[PDB]
Amino acid sequence: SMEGILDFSNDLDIALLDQVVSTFYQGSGVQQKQAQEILTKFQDNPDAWQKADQILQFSTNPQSKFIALSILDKLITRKWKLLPNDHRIGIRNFVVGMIISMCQDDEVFKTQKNLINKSDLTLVQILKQEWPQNWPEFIPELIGSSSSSVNVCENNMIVLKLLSEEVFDFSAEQMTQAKALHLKNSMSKEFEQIFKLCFQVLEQGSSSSLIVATLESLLRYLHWIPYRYIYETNILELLSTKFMTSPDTRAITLKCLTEVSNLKIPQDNDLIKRQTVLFFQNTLQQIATSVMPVTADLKATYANANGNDQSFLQDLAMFLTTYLARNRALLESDESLRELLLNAHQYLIQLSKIEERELFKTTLDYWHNLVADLFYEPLKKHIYEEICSQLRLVIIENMVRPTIQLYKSEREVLVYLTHLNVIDTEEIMISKLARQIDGSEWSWHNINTLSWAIGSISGTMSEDTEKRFVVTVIKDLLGLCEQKRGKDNKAVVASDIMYVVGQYPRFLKAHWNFLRTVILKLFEFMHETHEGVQDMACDTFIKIVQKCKYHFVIQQPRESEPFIQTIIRDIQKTTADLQPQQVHTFYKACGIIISEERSVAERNRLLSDLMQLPNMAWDTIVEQSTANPTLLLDSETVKIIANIIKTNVAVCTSMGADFYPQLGHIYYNMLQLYRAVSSMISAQVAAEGLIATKTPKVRGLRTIKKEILKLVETYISKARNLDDVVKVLVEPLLNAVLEDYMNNVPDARDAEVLNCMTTVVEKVGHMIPQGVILILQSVFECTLDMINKDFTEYPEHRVEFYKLLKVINEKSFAAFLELPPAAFKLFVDAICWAFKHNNRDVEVNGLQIALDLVKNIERMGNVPFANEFHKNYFFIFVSETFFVLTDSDHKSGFSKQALLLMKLISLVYDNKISVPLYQEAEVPQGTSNQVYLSQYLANMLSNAFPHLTSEQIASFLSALTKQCKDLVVFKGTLRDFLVQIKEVGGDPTDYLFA
């Protein structure tokens, strides 16, 4: 029975509407859900706008009047020009009339702000359509009627605020360039009268609500108005004094002054400089006397969250950082301004102590800006030495674990601050260390934080001072561990000690006997059952190895052999208690060291010894699993095999080209294992169905296949002898993987095969033309069929497929020329198919392939293949590109659609397509492609956007083709088209903007 109002045959039941609306807003359950689906239908009715004056006049429900203004807004924004003129003035006069009525009823003006603001916004939508050409005295009467009522004057500020936003802040992609410029110029011309009324209100008081509405509109003007309105009036004095005192105006005034600290002003006038100094002085004075003194605990204030204190401290941080980043040089020379400058930074110091991550990032950005200046600019750092001394403590005590970005920012600032005064930084950190030892600040979080800070300044002190500093820190950290009882605590300190030593490789490199002691201590930590210790020991080991590898490769004085030999020799004892992933890190660490040995015979010997255990385990299973493959369903055997391959991956990751000898030791049996594993996967899908791909036994088998492919791609991606890759590796690889992929059911096809093939083509693709053809024949059509029925299934194959086509089109384009015409047509279909993805991985590759393919066809010249390509597929690409440009569901790819489209258009207006793009009958002979291209596009757009006039389509196409050498202008013309198709009756002259 609620479905009643949906019938427009009868008259609207206003009382039924107010019930439907009240059920939706104040109701619940299916009752509310039912009212929801009928209010949308009433609103989405194309004729509902004619009933809107009933509701705004008859209804008793403010939400109903809101909804009807919404229906009106859709009318004004998209069909205003299609209306018979006389209704355009009825709607218009009705809205200002309704606004006038609501402003004189003090009851309505105070208790229906939602409805008034929505009405004010609806009026502004009308002004965008009609002003000033069809309403040239709006601004003179708006200013005249402000003298009438305080409620009208304040509401007019709401209208002006919203107007400024729609014209200058939110116009860039909501209107065409021409209409935006028209409205900006119009407001620019009449602003002198707007500023007179705004300044009068600000000086003459006295209603706070009127004052705040005037300041909120002033915030918007400051985005665009010329500087003279701010510096050549008294307005900076009242913002920086009168309006900073009252808490009603404080918040908005602060934001205005923050915008002023960004205005475009000449940097040579000495009056404007003193004005920039003066309003900062007044503002800080009001804050010291009316809000809080410079010594106040802003951290406690922020945590108590009384009133709007959090928003004020946030706005004050934004104000200080903005002003001081731009103008602090004005305050550094004059001695009378020294207290002003230092007080301002002392507030920032107090702001920096607030427990509020996002606020801290805002102040940290400014500190970074500051300390970098004191590091590079002469004669500045002595001004801020007490500020800097406090900043060192703030950052040391708020050091985060190394989010990713915050730590890097904290490190950079703290490193600058240590350069500016090494001695003060060193004294803060020992002191904090002492207060950890005596227990006054001892905490797991406080000792970890301090260790991160101490580790972060590495390499900033002299090697001598650093040596003395590290010895003191390690000494006292070792004593802190000694003194604590219980390993829950002893682990915490032992981890911090290891993190610190890992941060100081210059120290470790100069004291070998100490370096060896660290490594040997990490090894006994690799047997520690306590959780986290083993992980810590492995991470520190590889960290130290990366920075000190050379000291493991040489034989150290008073030793009998390079320490790498000692590590390898006891590797089984050392790694005996580790988890498999930890063993792989250890082997990876050893591979880093071995790569330092540049004598080939010695490097290969270390590789052989490192790989001894995995090669012995490998040789065993290769024999027994070939004899014969029942073991490969034992879940223990597949785990050992997978872990053998991962160990090879880990070592190959750090050794790269030097890994080739170990790859040769296992390559042919590994590819055989790949074949055997592929058989049992296939046999298991046959015996149990597609569900078998989810079982543990098959998932362990697919892990072997994936690790084998990952090993091969790891080596090939880093190989330097490309000839051995082509002559020894590529052939047995393709035989092992291509046919297995092609002849598996889709749910058993490893997308990693495509990724591996991508790596092959990327590195040696220019040397294997028959190899690339074989890859296309085995994977192209069968993978395309997996992914061309929807946009969701097989997401990995989708991405790897188009990465593979991308690199093939870049490196071995000849493979696409040897495709049969039907296969080539599927290639073109697959490219356009990628246009239509919202998946940005797929979509970006798809547009890039199309652009690269066009350039491939261009470089062929005047050849039968190039001619037929344009005959068959030029207009497909032009129309498919237009489709994703204009359908509103692929906006993320606008820039690359525009690029591809201009490349297509510029081909025709440069006569690079030598063959006519039409068939002989449809157009008179001798007609240029340019003429036919305009006719095809005009017909295409006319059918696709029938509400466009012919003159719109012709103006747009004329501008678009004339601008196909200027992307920036071209992209603006497309954005203008995208606006005009959202409405009816767009101005065709808008396309002359450029």
Binding site: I474, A494, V518
Partner: peptide
């Protein structure tokens, strides 16, 4: 202090 530091580190054990 470096030879002392060496000995203190080798004595670090988590189970006393």
């Amino acid at each position: 202090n470096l030879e002392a530091l060496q000995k203190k580190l080798e004595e670090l054990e988590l189970n006393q």
